[PDB]
A paper describes a structure:
The uncharacterized protein AMUC_1438 is encoded by a gene that was previously shown to be upregulated when the bacterium is grown on mucin. Here, we provide structural and functional support for the assignment of AMUC_1438 as a unique O-glycopeptidase with mucin-degrading capacity. Structural, kinetic, and mutagenic analyses point to a metzincin metalloprotease catalytic motif but with an active site that specifically recognizes a GalNAc residue α-linked to serine or threonine (i.e., the Tn-antigen). The enzyme catalyzes hydrolysis of the bond immediately N-terminal to the glycosylated residue.
We were unable to generate crystals of FL, but we were able to determine the structure of ALTL to 2.5 Å resolution. In this case, the last 18 amino acids in the two molecules in asymmetric unit were missing. The last ∼60 C-terminal amino acids that could be modeled, and which correspond to the missing residues in the ALT structure, comprised a three α-helix bundle resembling the Found In Various ARchitectures (FIVAR) domains observed as linkers in the ZmpB O-glycopeptidase from Clostridium perfringens. However, the relative orientations of the α-helical linker domain and the catalytic domain in the ALTL structure differ from the FL model, with the α-helical linker being packed more closely against the β-sandwich domain in ALTL than in the FL model. Indeed, the conformation observed in ALTL seems unlikely in the full-length enzyme as the position of the α-helical linker domain would likely result in clashes between the CBM-like domain, if it were present, and the rest of the protein. Toward providing support for the conformation observed in the FL model compared with the ALTL structure, we employed hydrogen-deuterium exchange mass spectrometry (HDX-MS) on both proteins. Most relevant to the FL model, however, is the increased exchange in the last two β-strands of the β-sandwich domain and the initial 1 to 2 turns of the first α-helix in the α-helical linker domain. In the ALTL crystal structure, these secondary structures are shielded from solvent by packing of the α-helical linker against the β-sandwich domain. In the FL model, however, the α-helical linker is peeled away from the β-sandwich domain, thus exposing the protein regions in FL that were observed to exchange more readily. Therefore, the HDX-MS results are consistent with conformation of the FL model.
Numbering used by the authors:
A (entry chain B): 18 to 458
B (entry chain A): 19 to 458
């Protein structure tokens, strides 16, 4: 109900199973938080100007609207998914307005480039934050540069306890522009002024999600009337409902699950484990293993049943489908709850997929904000043929059992043994390339 | 021509539009019989700046770009039922695109989105004049070595003169259409192929504007043909090479308009003395109708009428403009014109709930100009005839004066219906929409 920053409505209804999974996740996380110190983390804002690039007019009031819009959006989307209205807290002054730290870089735009705008702007943010007693390497920071397109950075990266977002200011940029239907003039993108603000501010929400540790997650068959996933193509649809263009952008339940363990969102200062490590995808990862893991083929999808070997508290599980040759934008995800013994059961589909072999990512969300992730080769079709899945049990049973237990080198040896013993058989030789690919992620 | 990633044809024209195209070309061919041939070419100018040197391979890359757009227009004109008409390029002894190099002795810091356009065209005029070419009598594509947010992406002109504006980028080439790798680090999260689609499809879109084409969106009669190039097709040009969709197609109503452009048909027809610019792109002349009746059908109207031909015409185009929408939201239908001026077309807008909608009727003359009138019409899903019948009893004199171009008399007659029967329910809703049409 905050019209001062053009608060976005909720234009989708969560599926009942995801809301039930959200409640079970928050119940588990709340028990984990009992007795742990509270978090005072805030999302800090730095405004970077340059030698021939002074601060734009009203940037303090306009970005007070922008961040409050993103803050309300995340809270409202968290609440729509079944969680409490969790969101990041801002630094407010005595008047309740957004505190923005101003930084300057003594370099002209001619001396800047697409590859240097990022690090140079963050370097200026480090200095101005340290002067105020804030360590940039231990907080989440949004760096706003007064740079144009083709020079300035639109980027985001981080994890649960540290992250950095990058965006660029523009004259009159404000969430109030979301309603404008007038066309922009003279630009390569033949698009309205309202969508242009959607790209800017919706992009900022997309980069901030990246800074919290969220990779890309596209739309799925289970949400055909919810708009575009914010961490997918939703960055370009954020606020489209205010122009009656569509359903806008929604926070995917699998992304809501991951953020529920972020201290910036839940307010609890949990400690990261010692074995946390960065991976190919955004986030912090720890080793994990399963007691059993089977993907059963169904019509246009898979039914994933398994039992996690829980050596640490976990609150949920997320299954991804990654089509070969596609980017992370093309993946779809399904979430599920975990019982105390570690059993889970979910169904993930990709209707119309003709490629047959597809990669599946199974992520276990731990209460310490980290994740354990494994990549499994699976076969899928419209009919739901069981023949490839049966060859995976008969020939590749030892490979899977070792792989889901994290024994990569032993699984490779067992994979080499079936290739040398039965590699000439047609039903075996087609599983070898997708198994070798899965064993290297 | 795979050397420049020639685009395929990903749509099939409706049979009536192809039949309309053949009848239009037959009429235009008779008009061209005995007229001098045209040597017009679309000239290309590359503008560099003080701290903005020419990008690598810009000569070979824009040889691919212009040949791609040239082949696209030819293939889309042929798909619509016309001969493979397109613009001709200036080719050297090796058959490569001739590019005129222009320089502006100003740094990029002194350029802006609003000033890059006119400053670039001025530099193009000088280098073209040095070669004996008058920019105000030809079609020119101005390419600036400028980034986004500084450089111009614009287009404007008519049948006998036009200017297109675009900006170069590192590695911009139609061969990039197939790339599915993500760009990264940009405000627009799009693949490298999508980025090239926006650049080159934009150029094709601006060139269409330079030929005299306004915006024309998609319509119900082509739901599986892709996006209209003069609508949102600028962002779908070449999408089929990534299996993203059907790409961009040239709307039959736009193909009709281009058939009278000397750059496309090769005949140097003379512009009439009464040609004038209008609210929309193109050259316009006064026109009138002997009769004009819109018959309501399901989700649309059937338009029958007879143009009062005071000059040779080869076709007619009807547009529907929903209230509150931009030019991107209009849909258009083309039709052929007989020697007496008779025409018959059907235009629909399924799902439109607004009831009252504006219709633009454009007559395409053989001298490259158009006559256009704006009519208020009513439309619904059922196809109810009641509002159109009240439109016949009242406002009868208003339409008769309006289709004869007598604006002031139509306004006076409109005030008479408001004073005599303005309280009647079947009359009072036509009054506001008629004043809007009489002022458009
Ligand atoms: Na065996
Ligand atoms: Zn991203
Ligand atoms: Zn345009």
């Amino acid at each position: 109900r905050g019209a001062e920053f053009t608060r976005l409505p909720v234009s989708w209804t969560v599926n009942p199973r995801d809301a039930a999974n959200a409640r079970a996740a928050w119940k588990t996380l709340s028990a984990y938080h009992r007795g742990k110190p509270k978090s005072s983390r805030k999302l800090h804002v730095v405004y970077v100007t340059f030698k021939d690039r002074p601060a734009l007019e009203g940037y303090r009031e306009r970005y007070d609207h922008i961040l409050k819009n993103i803050q309300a959006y995340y809270a409202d989307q968290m609440q729509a998914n079944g969680f409490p209205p969790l969101t990041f807290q801002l630094d407010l002054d005595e008047r309740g307005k957004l505190v923005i730290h101003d930084a300057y870089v003594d370099k002209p735009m001619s001396e800047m480039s697409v590859q240097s705008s990022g690090p140079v702007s963050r370097e200026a943010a480090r200095k101005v934050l340290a002067s105020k007693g804030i360590d940039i390497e231990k907080e989440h920071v949004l760096v706003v540069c007064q740079l144009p397109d083709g020079v300035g950075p639109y980027y985001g990266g981080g994890f649960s306890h540290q992250g950095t977002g990058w965006t660029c200011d523009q004259e009159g940029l404000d969430p109030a522009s979301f309603l404008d239907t007038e066309m922009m003039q003279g630009g390569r993108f033949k698009v309205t002024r309202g969508k242009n603000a959607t790209i800017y501010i919706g992009g900022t929400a997309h980069e901030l999600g990246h800074s919290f540790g969220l990779p890309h997650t596209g739309d799925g068959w289970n949400y055909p009337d919810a708009g575009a996933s914010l961490m997918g193509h939703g960055n370009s649809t954020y606020g489209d409902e205010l122009r009656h263009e569509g359903k806008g952008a929604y926070l995917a339940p699998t992304d809501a699950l991951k953020l529920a363990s972020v201290p910036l969102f839940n307010g609890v200062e949990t400690e990261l484990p010692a074995d946390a490590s960065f991976g190919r995808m955004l986030g912090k990862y720890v080793p994990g293993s399963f007691e059993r893991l089977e993907a059963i083929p169904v019509k246009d999808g898979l039914r994933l049943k398994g039992r996690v070997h829980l050596t640490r508290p976990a609150y949920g599980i997320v299954a991804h489908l990654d089509p070969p040759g596609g980017s992370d934008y093309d993946s779809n995800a399904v979430g599920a709850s975990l019982d105390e013994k570690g059993e889970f059961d979910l169904t993930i589909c990709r209707p119309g997929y003709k490629g047959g072999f597809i990669e599946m990512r199974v992520a276990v969300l731990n209460c310490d904000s980290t994740r354990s992730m494994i990549t499994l080769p699976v076969w899928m079709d419209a009919r739901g043929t069981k023949a490839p899945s049966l060859a995976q049990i008969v020939y590749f049973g030892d490979v899977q059992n070792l792989w889901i237990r994290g024994r990569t080198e032993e699984a490779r040896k067992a994979l080499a043994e079936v290739e040398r013993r039965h590699g000439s058989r047609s039903e075996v030789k087609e599983w070898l390339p997708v198994w070798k690919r899965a064993l290297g992620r």
